[PDB]
Structure formats: C-alpha cells, structure tokens
Amino acid sequence: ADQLTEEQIAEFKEAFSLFDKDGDGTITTKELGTVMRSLGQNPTEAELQDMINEVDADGNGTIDFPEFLTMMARKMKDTDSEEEIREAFRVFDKDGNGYISAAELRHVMTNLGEKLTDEEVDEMIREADIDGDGQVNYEEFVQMMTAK
Template identity: 85%
Template sequence: TIDFPEFLSLMARKMKDTDTEEELIEAFKVFDRDGNGFISAAELRHVMTNLGEKLTDEEVDEMIREADVDGDGQINYEEFVRMMMAK
C-alpha cells in the first residue's frame, strides 16, 4: 500500500520538472477525466491504477481527505496545486 506522503513524493518525482502553471493544468486534466473541474475519488483511483498503484477505497478516500481543503469530498484545481507544491 501507499500512504499519502509516499503518494506526494511519487507524484513529485514524476513531476519534478513540472512547476509551470501550464504543466500543472495539464496534470490536473489527466486526473479530472470528466473535465468538471474536480478530481473525484473514482478519478484519482483510475489514474493511480494506471500508474501501477493498486489502492483500496480507504486509501483513495484518505488521499482525497488529505488534499481536500474545503471538505467537499473532491479535489479542485487550487487544492491540487497546493498538494503538488507541498512536496
């Protein structure tokens, strides 16, 4: 299993050259598969699975909770940027 700090460092490694606004927007779009401006638990699980990380529902929910500043159960762009910059 992977915990949230490990997830962040994994993402930071994959994106260590990704600090421009443009690249962050592109990365967000990869997660936000339906384009609604939010990353849901299902979208996060899908991307993590594609990255080779098999996560339980609990792990995905925990990752959402860690990044979800406004408590709406999903990750918006601002929360995503904050999460990615927290590396």
C-alpha cells in the same frame, strides 16, 4: 509578482487532464485510482479518499484546481525524490530495456479519457529524448525530476 501563461497552465493542466475526464474544475476520489491503476499501483476504495484529506478543502473527497496541487507541491521536497528517481524508471519501464516509448504510454493514460492518443503524443518524447531511441532513457529522469 506571479504570472501564468499558456506555458505554465498546460503543465498545470497536464496533471488535471488525467484525474478529470472533461476538466470541470473538480475531480472525483475515484479518478485517483484511475491514475494509480495506470501507475500500476492503486489503493482500496477508502484508502484513495484519504489522498484528498491531505488538503481537505471541502472535506467531502472533491477538490478544485488551486487546492489539489498546493498541499502536494510542498510534499515533493518534504521526503526524498532521490529514492524516487529509480521508481519512475521501475514504473514506466514496461519491457525493462532502459527506454520507455510514448506509443504504449498514452494508451496507458487513455483508460482515463485522454483527448490524445498513445501514438500522436510521441511528438512529446522529443523533450526528454536525449538518447534518441524514440523513448525516455535513465539520463532524462535526473534532468527533468531533479532539475525542475
């Protein structure tokens, strides 16, 4: 049996809220670069359309809600997320102090069309803020990413 309430849908929507400006159920191949441009790394025009082909639901570059995360959910353990534990630390760390604040984080995601501000989101850091610096430490990565 499978059940998804407002708790499992918000974490499933949290990923769709970035690649979709209004959340119509389908995202453009151009939004990926909008998230990658936020990740700091973003590929060329055709190199980004190749990311939707990994699942090829419509083979047009557009993808639905249950179709994008499916081929991407099996690719988390189909590689090595340990080498990745340091990457999210290398990406998020703007000043390289060991803690990344949410104040800059959502202003960062805001270039996509967020309904949340870089400031008001900081109420969220409290979920991964184990060091209490109002930012995320190196200790929260292994807890949230390794222990899902």
